[PDB]
Amino acid sequence: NNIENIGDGAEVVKRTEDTSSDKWGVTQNIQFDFVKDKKYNKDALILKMQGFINSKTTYYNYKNTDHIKAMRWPFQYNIGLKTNDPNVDLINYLPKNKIDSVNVSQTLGYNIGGNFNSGPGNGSFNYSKTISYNQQNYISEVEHQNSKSVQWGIKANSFITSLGKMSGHDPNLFVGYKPYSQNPRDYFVPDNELPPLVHSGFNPSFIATVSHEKGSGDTSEFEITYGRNMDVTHATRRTGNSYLEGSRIHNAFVNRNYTVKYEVNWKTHEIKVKGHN
């Protein structure tokens, strides 16, 4: 049913965990793929990190003013995986390098004997998992890594505005066309002109493989963190005719994260949520 035979003397035990937080506006859909291979000297678990991180983009009036209005938006999305267990090792993860393409689609391949690789286009190994996500206008890069952790940043990068090409740091990024409006939303460009990561949110698709030493302990725990770093753009009406000017508070609210702690059983191939925030 949920055990797939992959080669001669090898199989994959597939488990799934789903957890949403109205507190953080995050859904975490984790796939745990246990590699049971006679020709491989270690226990191996492939984690596919998916779900949704709501952009939580809000538009509000600045204080008791009628002419200064603000937009709070996600400058960067946070994706992280850590283990406390001393017997566990982070052996790979996808994406490995800084990547600016609109759609990030990569493939991790496995071959009997503990051989892991990356797919070209399509390849045929014993087992494989594919990552697939869109990051229009954003850039993906590894912020931190060691044998126990991996942290990705999906940050605002390059945008084609009316005033030409803009960086993610441009203070006029997202300033609108309606200075006389009384609605904070009107002070900023419409959804049609916004990237999905700003108007809606992020659908992560990340992979990490962990190796456990056989018989060093039945259970292991991993913490998976999904979040966002929020910027504040203040649009002020300048007065011939009237226009709007933007000013930025960069990293106004950092580490708005949803962290879930999962417990894994190497013998029974069972999953438990230990806790969360």
Numbering used by the authors: 2 to 121, 125 to 243, 247 to 284
Task: Quote the original article.
Panton-Valentine leukocidin (PVL) is associated with necrotizing skin infections, such as boils, and plays an important role in the poor prognosis of necrotizing pneumonia. Two additional structural domains are also found: the rim domain anchors the protein to the membrane surface, while the stem domain, closely apposed to the core β-sandwich in the soluble form, contributes two β-strands to the pore β-barrel. Since the binding of LukS-PV to the membrane is a saturable process, the necessary presence of a LukS-PV receptor on the cell surface was thus proposed. This was recently confirmed by Spaan et al. who showed that the C5a receptor is required for the binding of LukS-PV to human neutrophils.
The mutants exhibiting significantly decreased binding abilities with respect to wild-type LukS-PV were: R73A, Y184A, T244A, H245A, and Y250A, with Ki values ranging from 1.8 to 6.2 nM, i.e. a 69- to 238-fold increase compared to the Ki value of wild-type LukS-PV. The T244A, Y246A and N248A mutated proteins crystallized in identical conditions (50% PEG 200, 0.1 M MES-NaOH, pH 7.50). The corresponding crystals belonged to the P43212 space group, with similar cell parameters (a = b∼94 Å and c∼308 Å) and 4 molecules per asymmetric unit. In the case of the rim domain, wild-type LukS-PV and mutants T244A, Y246A and N248A displayed only small differences, with r.m.s. deviations comprised between 0.20 Å and 0.30 Å, whereas the structure of the rim domain of the Y184A and Y250A mutants were markedly different, with r.m.s. deviations of 1.10 Å and 1.28 Å, respectively, when compared to the wild-type LukS-PV structure. Three of the four most sensitive residues (Y184, T244 and Y250) are found in this region, at close distance from each other. Indeed, three of the five most sensitive residues identified (T244, H245 and Y250) are located in this loop and form a surface that could represent the principal binding site for the receptor.
